[PDB]
Design a protein around this ligand. Structure first.
Ligand SMILES: Nc1ncnc2c1ncn2[C@@H]1O[C@H](CSCC[C@H](N)C(=O)O)[C@@H](O)[C@H]1O
Ligand SMILES: Nc1ncnc2c1ncn2[C@@H]1O[C@H](CSCC[C@H](N)C(=O)O)[C@@H](O)[C@H]1O
Ligand SMILES: COc1cc2c(cc1O)[C@@H]1Cc3ccc(OC)c(O)c3CN1CC2
Ligand SMILES: COc1cc2c(cc1O)[C@@H]1Cc3ccc(OC)c(O)c3CN1CC2
Lengths: 354, 344
């Protein structure tokens, strides 16, 4: 009935915004610091937030966020015999991490988690674009990001240093997670002497490849406003330019999370520029979440549908593709011998050979 | 496994924004005009959108929105390249009824409105900073002051409350008979008066009075058997034989609620009652409608107004007793919705 559906539909905006608040308050990491199988109260978590130390009401407000995440199975909820054991009312339940929220705890060794990518995809710049999503259906050649912000996303990033940082860091940390999965399955880097990352962001991806395979000379290529903020990484040379004008010569190339932002004509133009800059026997690796041939209720399907909706909002022509669709782009640009390599939950390496 | 959890976590922002776009495009009503049991393609739906008629790519974009909603159990998906989409129990509640246009669309458009989402961007302020209110941090004014200067937000909020009110009262009238033999009812913070219009339609001997702020009363429609009055409920309430407070107490802290309830007490006769209509926080929370029906507004009011929160039956009784009321009768209606009578 209506008053069942109010709950099912009304919670949809609330959960991500509660999650974003919890990530910004570092709730998950604070719970993790209490140890294995920790179950802690809002009051205990708030005690570890210096910014809350003069706010008597902080724990009660925090509990209102955490109990929604508990109801949603992002946190586990429990109590104790000591709390149970008639005229006193215990409001505070105890919260613990779940499989999903463990992925929101920065790793002790290097700080990696899904936090940075999830903070990008719920950033105000992205949500403001989503408020204009209907324009793609109504208006020929409209792009929601352009309707919201008056510029395309990569042009906007060159004017807006906060957005540039959020986007660049979201891609970079997510890249680390993805390459850990790639290196467990894929052995195609072992024989390479040089790798050029085309649209490589701040260079994190090629830094990790060179760290794993130290005979590889790494080159990172991106737009001027990205290269200007890129760190110095061991074994990585940075190159600024425009991949639709000219790609540097390299023995092998990587395109990770690049083709999915662009329509077919732009993708063929870029792939022809890569072909022109590769030697005979070179290859370009495409790393993307591949759209399954039949969608279902599984991680592989959602791993493609999420960026499919984001790129529809964020850039003209951007979309997720099937293996067949990627093969067609490579073949149009002159490549032969397409080799799709499943990695994990829809993530693939697709090799295009010159 | 990070790349399993990317799907579970990354879809959380995408689903509501896809849903908002589908409601703004009137997708669910367009499917329903083929028949409530119909299963129709994106191309068939787009063909019913005049704004898309010069956009060859409209259907393909629409399909990308709808397939996410189909993966999220808001639409059914089936094969006859184009998949066919059908309504579900949830999306039937997004089809304006053929009789009167009522659905959950207006309230869901309000709770995902930019003014609300911009407040939620500031939600962490309520934890860090004593006395902050996310809405105020985001907008520079409190929500009822903002509504007075922002006609679009005023409309979205008022219409969300009003249409939601109709489905709530349909549920109330199934269970609750306490309006019978009332002769006069004052709706304190009644919005644009839809609630009292529905009560007077069911109970034709009630003289209904709708009481709200000037910026709401000046946009309220004329309803049969309803008189509109503007004022400030914290200063005084008009005399009335019986009163209604629906979705009012949950916006305010305890001291403000007791002040309002004492104003109501002063304006009631001996034997009068005030009815509180709210989603009541249950004693145990879980993954169920009663729980979420309270947690959703609890989070929204945390963001939107100082002191706002959902309350248990015990907490409501404490407010009424502090204001001089001497019998509390809680009446469950549906999925956590209650009528709570406070007797003078
Ligand atoms: N014309 C152009 N030339 C070069 N790089 C571009 C470009 N248009 C966009 N890009 C870059 O394409 C990248 C897409 S995001 C992916 C970054 C990285 N390969 C990773 O997988 O994490 C951005 O860093 C963006 O600045
Ligand atoms: N000081 C005040 N005096 C009167 N009404 C007020 C007020 N402060 C807020 N309100 C009104 O309180 C209402 C809360 S929203 C609920 C409206 C209605 N009772 C319904 O259930 O649908 C708004 O219409 C708002 O304008
Ligand atoms: C499964 O969950 C997700 C998967 C992916 C992204 C975000 C998710 O949450 C990001 C989103 C995104 C947005 C804009 C981009 O360029 C403008 C871009 O390259 C990417 C990369 N993709 C990689 C795949
Ligand atoms: C279960 O889902 C929902 C339940 C409820 C609301 C919205 C939901 O989506 C709205 C949200 C809201 C926001 C602000 C208010 O005053 C400033 C207000 O009175 C209300 C009313 N409540 C009633 C309960």
């Amino acid at each position: 009935c209506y008053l069942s559906e109010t709950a099912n539909l009304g919670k949809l905006i609330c959960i991500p915004m509660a999650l974003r608040a919890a990530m910004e308050l570092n709730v998950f990491q604070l719970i993790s610091k209490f140890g294995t199988d920790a179950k802690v109260s809002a009051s205990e978590i708030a005690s570890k937030m210096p910014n809350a130390k003069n706010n008597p009401e902080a724990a009660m407000y925090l509990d209102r966020i955490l109990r929604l995440l508990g109801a949603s199975s992002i946190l586990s909820v429990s109590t104790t015999a000591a709390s149970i054991n008639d005229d006193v009312v215990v409001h505070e339940k105890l919260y613990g991490l779940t499989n999903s929220s463990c992925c929101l705890v920065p790793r002790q060794e290097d700080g990696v988690s899904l936090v940075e990518e999830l903070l990008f995809t719920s950033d105000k710049v992205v949500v403001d674009s989503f408020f204009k999503l209907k324009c793609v259906v109504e208006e020929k050649d409209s792009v929601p990001f352009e309707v919201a912000h008056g510029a395309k996303i990569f042009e906007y990033a060159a004017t807006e240093p906060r957005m540039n940082q959020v986007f660049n860091d979201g891609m970079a940390v997510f890249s680390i997670v993805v390459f850990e999965a790639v290196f467990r399955v894929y052995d195609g880097f072992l024989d390479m002497k040089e790798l050029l990352d085309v649209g490589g962001g701040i260079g994190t991806s090629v830094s990790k490849i060179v760290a794993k395979y130290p005979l590889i000379r790494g080159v990172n290529f991106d737009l001027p406003h990205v290269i200007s903020v890129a760190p110095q990484y061991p074994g990585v040379e940075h190159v600024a330019g425009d991949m639709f004008e000219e790609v540097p010569k390299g023995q092998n190339m990587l395109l990770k999370w690049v083709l999915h932002a662009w329509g077919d004509e732009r993708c063929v133009k870029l792939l022809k520029n890569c072909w022109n800059s590769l030697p005979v026997g070179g290859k370009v690796l495409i790393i993307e979440f591949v759209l399954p041939n039949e969608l279902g209720n599984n991680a592989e399907s959602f791993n493609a549908l999420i960026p499919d909706l984001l790129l529809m909002a964020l850039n003209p022509g951007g979309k997720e593709r099937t293996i067949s669709e990627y093969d067609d782009l490579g073949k149009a640009a002159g490549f032969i011998k397409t080799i799709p390599i499943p990695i994990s939950n829809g993530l693939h390496v697709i090799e295009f050979h010159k």
